[PDB]
From a paper:
The family of ρ-type [name] receptors includes potential therapeutic targets in several neurological conditions, and features distinctive pharmacology compared to other subtypes. Channels in this family share a common architecture, with each of the five subunits contributing to an extracellular domain (ECD) with 10 strands (β1–β10) and a transmembrane domain (TMD) with 4 helices (M1–M4). The orthosteric ligand-binding site is located at the subunit interface in the ECD, composed of loops A, B and C from the principal subunit and D, E and F from the complementary subunit. We implemented a modified human ρ1 [name] receptor construct (ρ1-EM) with truncated loops in the N-terminus and intracellular domain and an inserted fluorescent protein to facilitate expression while largely preserving wild-type function.
In Xenopus laevis oocytes expressing ρ1-EM, THIP and [name] antagonized [name] activation, consistent with previous studies of wild-type channels. In our cryo-EM structure, [name] adopted an elongated pose, with its aminopropyl tail forming a salt bridge with E217 and cation-π interactions with the aromatic cage on the principal subunit face. The complex was comparable to the apo and THIP structures, and superimposable with our previous structure with TPMPA (Cα RMSD 0.035 Å), including analogous interactions of the amino and phosphinic acid groups; the additional butyl tail only required an alternative rotamer of M177 in the β5 strand. As in the case of TPMPA, the bulky, electronegative phosphinic acid group appeared to prevent lockdown of loop C over the antagonist, indicating a shared mechanism as well as binding pose among phosphinic acid inhibitors. The [name] pose from our ρ1-EM structure could be placed in this pocket in the GABAB receptor complex by superposition on its equivalent aminopropyl and phosphinic acid moieties, or by computational docking, with similar poses showing no evident clashes and a favorable binding energy score. Interestingly, the amino group of [name] was oriented roughly opposite to that of CGP35348 in its resolved site, indicating the rotational flexibility of these compounds could support their polymodal activities.
Numbering used by the authors:
A (entry chain A), B (entry chain B), C (entry chain C), D (entry chain D), E (entry chain E): 74 to 377, 451 to 479
Write the structure that this text describes.
Amino acid sequence: KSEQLLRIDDHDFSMRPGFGGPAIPVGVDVQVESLDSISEVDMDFTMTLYLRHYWKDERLSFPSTNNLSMTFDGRLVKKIWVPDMFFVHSKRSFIHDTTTDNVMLRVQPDGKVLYSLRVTVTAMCNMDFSRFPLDTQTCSLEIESYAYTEDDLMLYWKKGNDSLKTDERISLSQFLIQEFHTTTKLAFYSSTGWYNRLYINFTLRRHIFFFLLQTYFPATLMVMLSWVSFWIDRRAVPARVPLGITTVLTMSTIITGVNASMPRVSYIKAVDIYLWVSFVFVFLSVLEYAAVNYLTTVQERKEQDTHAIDKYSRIIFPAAYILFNLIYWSIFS
Amino acid sequence: KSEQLLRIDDHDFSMRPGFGGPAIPVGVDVQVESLDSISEVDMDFTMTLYLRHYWKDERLSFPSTNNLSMTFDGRLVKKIWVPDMFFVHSKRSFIHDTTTDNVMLRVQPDGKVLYSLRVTVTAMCNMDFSRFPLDTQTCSLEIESYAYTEDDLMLYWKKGNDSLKTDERISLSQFLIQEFHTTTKLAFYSSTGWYNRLYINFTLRRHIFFFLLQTYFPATLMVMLSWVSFWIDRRAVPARVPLGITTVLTMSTIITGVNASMPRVSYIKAVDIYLWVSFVFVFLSVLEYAAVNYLTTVQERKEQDTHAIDKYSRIIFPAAYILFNLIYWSIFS
Amino acid sequence: KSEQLLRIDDHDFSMRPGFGGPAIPVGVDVQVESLDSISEVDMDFTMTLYLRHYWKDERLSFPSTNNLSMTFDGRLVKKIWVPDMFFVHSKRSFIHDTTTDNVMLRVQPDGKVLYSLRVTVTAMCNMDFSRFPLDTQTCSLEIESYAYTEDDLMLYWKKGNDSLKTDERISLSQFLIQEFHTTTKLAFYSSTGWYNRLYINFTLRRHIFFFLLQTYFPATLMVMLSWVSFWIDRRAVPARVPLGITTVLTMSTIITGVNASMPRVSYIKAVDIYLWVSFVFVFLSVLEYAAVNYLTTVQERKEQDTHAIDKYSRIIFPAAYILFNLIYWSIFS
Amino acid sequence: KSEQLLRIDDHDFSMRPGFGGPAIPVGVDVQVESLDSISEVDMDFTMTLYLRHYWKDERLSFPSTNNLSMTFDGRLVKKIWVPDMFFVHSKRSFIHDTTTDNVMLRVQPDGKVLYSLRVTVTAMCNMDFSRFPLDTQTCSLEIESYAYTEDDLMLYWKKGNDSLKTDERISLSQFLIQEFHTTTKLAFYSSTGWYNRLYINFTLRRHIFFFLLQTYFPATLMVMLSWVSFWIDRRAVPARVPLGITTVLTMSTIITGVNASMPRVSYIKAVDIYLWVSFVFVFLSVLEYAAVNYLTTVQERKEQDTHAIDKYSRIIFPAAYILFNLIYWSIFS
Amino acid sequence: KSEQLLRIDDHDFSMRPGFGGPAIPVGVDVQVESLDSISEVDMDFTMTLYLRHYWKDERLSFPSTNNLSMTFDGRLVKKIWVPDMFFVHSKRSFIHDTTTDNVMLRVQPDGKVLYSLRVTVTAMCNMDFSRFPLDTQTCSLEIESYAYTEDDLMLYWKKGNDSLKTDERISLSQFLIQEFHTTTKLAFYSSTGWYNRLYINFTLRRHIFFFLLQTYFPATLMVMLSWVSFWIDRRAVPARVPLGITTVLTMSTIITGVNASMPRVSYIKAVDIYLWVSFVFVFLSVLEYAAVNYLTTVQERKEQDTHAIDKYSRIIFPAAYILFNLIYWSIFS
Ligand SMILES: *[C@@H]1O[C@H](CO)[C@@H](O)[C@H](O)[C@H]1NC(C)=O
Ligand SMILES: *[C@@H]1O[C@H](CO)[C@@H](O)[C@H](O)[C@H]1NC(C)=O
Ligand SMILES: *[C@@H]1O[C@H](CO)[C@@H](O)[C@H](O)[C@H]1NC(C)=O
Ligand SMILES: *[C@@H]1O[C@H](CO)[C@@H](O)[C@H](O)[C@H]1NC(C)=O
Ligand SMILES: *[C@@H]1O[C@H](CO)[C@@H](O)[C@H](O)[C@H]1NC(C)=O
Ligand SMILES: CCCCCCCCCCCC
Ligand SMILES: CCCCCCCCCCCC
Ligand SMILES: CCCCCCCCCCCC
Ligand SMILES: CCCCCCCCCCCC
Ligand SMILES: CCCCCCCCCCCC
Ligand SMILES: CCCCP(=O)(O)CCCN
Ligand SMILES: CCCCP(=O)(O)CCCN
Ligand SMILES: CCCCP(=O)(O)CCCN
Ligand SMILES: CCCCP(=O)(O)CCCN
Ligand SMILES: CCCCP(=O)(O)CCCN
Ligand SMILES: CCCCCCCC
Ligand SMILES: CCCCCCCC
Ligand SMILES: CCCCCCCC
Ligand SMILES: CCCCCCCC
Ligand SMILES: CCCCCCCC
Ligand SMILES: CCCCCC
Ligand SMILES: CCCCCC
Ligand SMILES: CCCCCC
Ligand SMILES: CCCCCC
Ligand SMILES: CCCCCC
Ligand SMILES: CCCCCC
Ligand SMILES: CCCCCC
Ligand SMILES: CCCCCC
Ligand SMILES: CCCCCC
Ligand SMILES: CCCCCC
Ligand SMILES: CCCCCC
Ligand SMILES: CCCCCC
Ligand SMILES: CCCCCC
Ligand SMILES: [Cl-]
Ligand SMILES: [Cl-]
């Protein structure tokens, strides 16, 4: 029996290696396999990865006439001491178990141990949509020991920034992913003390041109279309009135359609500001002709060429819209 | 073996400490990690948190030449007595178990015990949407012992209002969160007796300006647009009629779009009252011109300037709308 | 050890108390905590409740110098006999287990037993939507023994109609709940025999005024709007035609919007009958003017005041609509 | 102990009864409790039912002074041999376990056994939507032994067609259910040999009148409405043009609304053919007036009653539409 | 006892057969039962299948007077050595367990073993939607050993390309499936070494004609409809203006409806290019008449047949649209 080469029953494996003395160092490496999904309303993301641990335990040393190591599956884990890592700020997680538990332990003749397992985790990520669709988001995944403070267990990245590897084909449907890197920081709990925490960081961006074409283009086109009435004969009332009211209806249907396709976030975003300013411009173009028609009727009744209001509007409306665009795009980049 | 320092087999751990005498006090602290989601149709919310217990048991005392404590994981829980807390009015819950069970027990030389675990819970919260979107909601999470009355177990907050801590970055996508605090109250069950119950309370609010811009603004603009026809020449029938009917169509499409984007709650809310009053105003503006056209035709036929009805409507319609707004906003704040 | 006061190993607890003789009576009480959700497309509902059992077993009697009882958690259940209740016509269910299993057993010195547990269940409820939105639904939850016929186990409500309690704040978002009560009935299985079955009954109703305002009001308003054309000068063709076609478009958009907001049930309901009759009325109002215009043109061509058709339509259309409303509301209440 | 009346430890229950000789017959009965849901996009359905097995085993015979049988729950199953049935072509399934496992075994003095359990299963059902909404679908549920060929285990329906019972109130929201019956057939696996397979068959149909009223009626009405322009004076251009373009807009909104409410199946169905032919008819009615207006203008310019094209169109359009309807309804029933 | 014919307690089954020498070959066969679902937003698919393993182990040989084999269920798996296969790049998986675990082991007298189980798996599949709806996708499922390198375990397809079988009725609702085949490739891990990997490959295609009819047809029809205005008398302003603005509204509603029915992928696809070019064509047709009306008014005022712009537009617009179509369909096939 291979489990008799390790004196399992001759040691108390409820205590850590080196108990009573200096803390035992534990090194960590991570390989990220995929990014599975992201939820903008609930503000979280899901990832699948391999987690690997390295440490030494003299109680597991065994004699050998060669330098070959022994390999075990998950059934040995319950018989020896292993580190208790957990994911901070997570919502749910599990360890894969088909066709059996995806775990393993490799033991060297001198007592060095490698511990490897495959896991899927869902983690929280606070997002800010004020600048949508030109926003940028930063997310992180955090790893910590549940029960051992830094006086008993010292947790660190085994090879610095070389400890993190990512799959060549990692992708998300609606985002671009960039800038993976690692950091570390100490955390304090008033109940028990100081703990080491490890971080994996990355950044997300959107495809700007899709949103420009889908949203900003039609609204600008409809605003430009409302200016055509300034060049039409003021005596053609049955042509001037329906044009304005139909332009208002078209802009309203565009805004409703755009609202139906964005994530349901109930606060003001940049694209909403652009759309409602455009709507106001279209509304004012109808008030202009109402004033022109009333004044012309008054003059004809009193008495019994282009009106000045049309002449000024032909210049004033586009200049104001251009100024609004300059200010908007200088503010929102 | 560390489990032989505690005389596990020398005591009956199916009975409570102090059995037969006064009740044993148990103190509680809570740390809230995140708020995960909220469901308005099903009226519930989900939270993740750390739960900690404090009590003393002389049967667990052990000799020591120093003042160091001993730490165990979840496997020891089945061998000793622990308190049986549960969440009142919950729908589902679970204890996190990656990479192992997130539990631990720390025992002092004199028998003081700390018991800590990490849990996620979904709890019910009755909501009232009568004043939407200006409504305010209050929710709570409740903790109680399943099997021990106040004569056997005395449950209390360990440090009063200092027993509750919340994460600095706790947030929800569509709500603002404020005013966390704790309370206690006694509950009675006719089957078994009186029990102590603990409460965690907080309040939720919406972003008002988003809803004002998205709903109240377009409806007011369309009502103001329907008043333009009162200043148009009454002889221009092919201009007056299509304008009114198209305004009615536009208002209908706005209301349908607004209904499609709110939570599916099937009873009358304040925003519905505002929208349908505006729709009635638009309808009456079409009836007005129908009457004017009929009377003018009658006069011309009998026989073979501005009509009085237009002159009065130009004043009467805006004043009535202003009065309705004053009453509405004095009632609904 | 408290489990040695009961002679656990001295009895066969695979057989029922009173084996070989008359059936053992088992009394039941229920406390309903909440109604969690309802699904109209799948026709089911979800409930959380406390289930309590009462019976006597002389094998569990123990000596005592007082009248104190002994209390145990769920670990003792596997060592003694307990009744095997299950929920008939259910789709899924589970027993709550945080922070431990929500079970308990209390034993009196003379052998009386109380058995209590907390459970969540989803149950089927056939619904009929023919009279929507004026429909009424009745639902029930059913409890039965899996393996014991009425000759071996007699199941009954412990205190008649006083055995059922409901929470003061029980509510559903889109329904009103009324008339909780209990019944019993015998059921027959050809495979094994006769069994006792217990029932919990209640009734659901909708908020009528919300549906009246959202659906019936706009359709009636549009039908009334289509009658305006009967009072407009027949010589104003460019005013009469667009009005009718735009009214048809508006009614179509209303019907599409209403269809989008009801539960996806694919058979004919009362509100559909009302909407499509209104649509037919609007269609006929356009055919009327087509006939008038053709006849006037014919007369003028042959040759080279109000037409009779308008005069009759002004009376005939509203009277027919009123008659339809009287018949409809006498049929559907 | 009742388990000592059966000599459990005196037999090897890893082998089948009658090992080494002729196959053991196993009879099956089924009672269907409900149909829980159906998914048209994923093509599957869910059912809850009772499964019962009958066979004889002389190793379980016990002495008795009467003819009473002994009843056990699910804990005995692991100690004896039972048949290993599984559901072919299923996606997921489970056995109900509240308040305990819904299993039982009854043993007669001579060794006859009844084995009963309650289960929920989701099974695949390939569907064809070419004739929607006039399509008919056939589904089945299949039962087979996992590890025993027909040489070792003979599986059959215990009472032929009387072995299947269904609940009196079984229903689905959007379908009608008819024609339950059973069949059997032999299946071949190249890896291990021949196996017996049992089938449960049924048929589904839709409510035709709901779909006729919701889809076919409005499209026919709009096609008939487009024919009104053929009777309007050709000199009234501002009446003829807007009518045609608005009819096109109305038909487009109807088609979009209809597409939004059907199951998302991306290939051509019969109702799509009807709708797009109607759209083509409406388009041609606008081209007709364009030609008429151009020819009239040409004649007046050259020079400086009803046109023949209108006279022919008044006859030709309805006859072609009637012919299309005759062919369509002769093809699709 | 059949488990005593195999000397279970006489061997260490924590080590592989042939330990210390050449690697043990393991052959694999696969039978695919169904394709359950596909998710375009999350980019994954789900499959159900049978997995079979073949290898030899002399430690399991048993004496026999015949050539009959012995069959066991899943309970024996924990007592012997079996291969540890897992699915690479998967998100979730499970082994079916109704009415018991769907596993089995067959052992020949000379020690040959067959190991069979039924499993469901969800796997990732990166997709590219640039050419939608004319895109083609390729997916794969991958199988690998968790803990044994190629020096200890040699994994291969048992019968080459004959090792893969698929069900005759495999189908997906929205895709066509073709070209199943197998491959193999070696993979390298810096942590442990080289491993053998097996692949199952297949291809997916859409139904082109459904998308052509639903999207490309209406847009082309509306572009052709906008050209009618070039043949209408330029003096009929109240006919020319509303026609153009209503055509713009119709095209906008078509585009919104089409966007609502495609998978929510936020980057530019081929069908979007076609739709927005068509929208631009419709917009330019309105600018053309604005210019014509202004020039005619200027000429009449100065002074106090067909205009040249209409004559050129009647030719220029269709030729440009035809050229765009030729380029588009030569690029996108
Ligand atoms: C790894 O590189 C990143 C690059 O930004 C840096 O921030 C981080 O500190 C580096 N970590 C180590 C351990 O070198
Ligand atoms: C904590 O403060 C809140 C503030 O409202 C108060 O209501 C509550 O009673 C306080 N509880 C304790 C234990 O002081
Ligand atoms: C309880 O009251 C209801 C009231 O309708 C009645 O139907 C039922 O029979 C009563 N049951 C008992 C046990 O009294
Ligand atoms: C049961 O009746 C159906 C009726 O169609 C028939 O097809 C089937 O063969 C019958 N089966 C038996 C076992 O009689
Ligand atoms: C099986 O056939 C496919 C056909 O494309 C080929 O690519 C593959 O290499 C073949 N594999 C074997 C093992 O013959
Ligand atoms: C509330 C946070 C600042 C946002 C201010 C936006 C103002 C938008 C006005 C648009 C008027 C149509
Ligand atoms: C039913 C609860 C009181 C709500 C009353 C609202 C009345 C709205 C009338 C709107 C008419 C258009
Ligand atoms: C099919 C069950 C009876 C329903 C009959 C409704 C008839 C509705 C006709 C509406 C015509 C527009
Ligand atoms: C592709 C399978 C045959 C379906 C043929 C339908 C043709 C529809 C033409 C409709 C033109 C508007
Ligand atoms: C961004 C990837 C290349 C896509 C270029 C498409 C340009 C579309 C222009 C449409 C104008 C209406
Ligand atoms: C007995 C162990 C208590 C652990 P704790 O103080 O709850 C901190 C957990 C996160 N590192
Ligand atoms: C034997 C224990 C019964 C507990 P109960 O009377 O059901 C009250 C549960 C909530 N504190
Ligand atoms: C051996 C027990 C069989 C029970 P059955 O005859 O299947 C009836 C189950 C519902 N009371
Ligand atoms: C060792 C048992 C193999 C069973 P198999 O040949 O995979 C057929 C399974 C369906 N009846
Ligand atoms: C001790 C075993 C480590 C395995 P690993 O190096 O993590 C590679 C897993 C995939 N074949
Ligand atoms: C209309 C676009 C002008 C603004 C471009 C960016 C200048 C800051
Ligand atoms: C139109 C807004 C007037 C009401 C503002 C609030 C006054 C009570
Ligand atoms: C228009 C409503 C009249 C019908 C009311 C109810 C009379 C039966
Ligand atoms: C317009 C309906 C005529 C077709 C009915 C069915 C004749 C085959
Ligand atoms: C309008 C269709 C012409 C293009 C067909 C394909 C030629 C490359
Ligand atoms: C919004 C412009 C109105 C014109 C009156 C000067
Ligand atoms: C933009 C309209 C200005 C009115 C002319 C004073
Ligand atoms: C929120 C500031 C935006 C200002 C608009 C240009
Ligand atoms: C609603 C106003 C009607 C006008 C008749 C006095
Ligand atoms: C608001 C219309 C009043 C009619 C004039 C008496
Ligand atoms: C529907 C009314 C038509 C008028 C012909 C008498
Ligand atoms: C309702 C129209 C009747 C036609 C006059 C005979
Ligand atoms: C289904 C009967 C309704 C009749 C309409 C009044
Ligand atoms: C579609 C009909 C066109 C008329 C030209 C003869
Ligand atoms: C249907 C239009 C036919 C044109 C007359 C020859
Ligand atoms: C887009 C065409 C405009 C006409 C001016 C030459
Ligand atoms: C397409 C319009 C061209 C204008 C004539 C020069
Ligand atoms: C992305 C290239 C498409 C060009 C349009 C013909
Ligand atoms: Cl006009
Ligand atoms: Cl006109």
